[PDB]
């Protein structure tokens, strides 16, 4: 049941990536602009079992 949260996370965070790309991409023909490259980080959830 908590799996949905993890999936939600991904979906939500993917939108953030989209946002970055969009700001990264609207800024073509902006002088000297430095593209803000982006990555996704796995975050383990170290816990009491499994």
């Amino acid at each position: 049941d908590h799996a949905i949260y993890t999936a939600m996370g991904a979906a939500s965070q993917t939108l953030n990536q989209q946002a970055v790309t969009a700001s990264n991409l609207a800024n073509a023909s902006t002088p000297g602009f430095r593209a803000q490259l982006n990555a996704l980080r796995a975050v383990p959830v170290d816990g009491l079992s499994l």
Binding site: A3, T6, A7, G9, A10, A39, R41, A42, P44, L50
Partner: protein
């Protein structure tokens, strides 16, 4: 806990853990780094039969989650940190089709065990009306 409820509930727990692992894979596919900085190694679960002493059958236990040790497909970005000599980022090796099929099958098995539990519960509650 009656034996059959234990069997089906262990099935439910195992299916939930399998679906969680599949979701974590499908979500962290294309994840450059872990916390310390290492590839996300694709995760699988291990299904084994339960009730080892006695009748050799009954229930499923998913002890010992392991890692899928396939050679962790690489990409080339030799400006990215986490790239060794021969700049080669490590790029988790999750096969999306396999994980989607795992999610579908896990949901179906979960449903089957849930609905076994309902059947058995009706069976026992009817047994309580034996005679009277």
């Amino acid at each position: 806990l009656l034996n059959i409820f234990d069997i089906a509930g262990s099935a439910l727990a195992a299916q939930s853990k399998r679906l969680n692992v599949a979701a974590s894979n499908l979500a962290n596919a294309d994840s450059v780094t872990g916390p310390d900085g290492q590839p996300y190694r694709a995760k699988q679960v291990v299904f084994q039969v339960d009730a080892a002493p006695g009748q050799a059958t009954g229930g499923v236990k998913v002890a010992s989650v392991i890692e899928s040790q396939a050679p962790e497909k690489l990409v080339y970005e030799p400006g990215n940190p986490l790239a060794d000599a021969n700049g080669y980022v490590k790029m988790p090796n999750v096969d999306v089709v396999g994980e989607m099929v795992n999610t579908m099958s896990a949901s179906r098995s979960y449903q089957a065990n849930i609905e076994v539990l309902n059947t058995v519960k009706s069976m026992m509650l009817k047994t309580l009306t034996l005679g009277q």
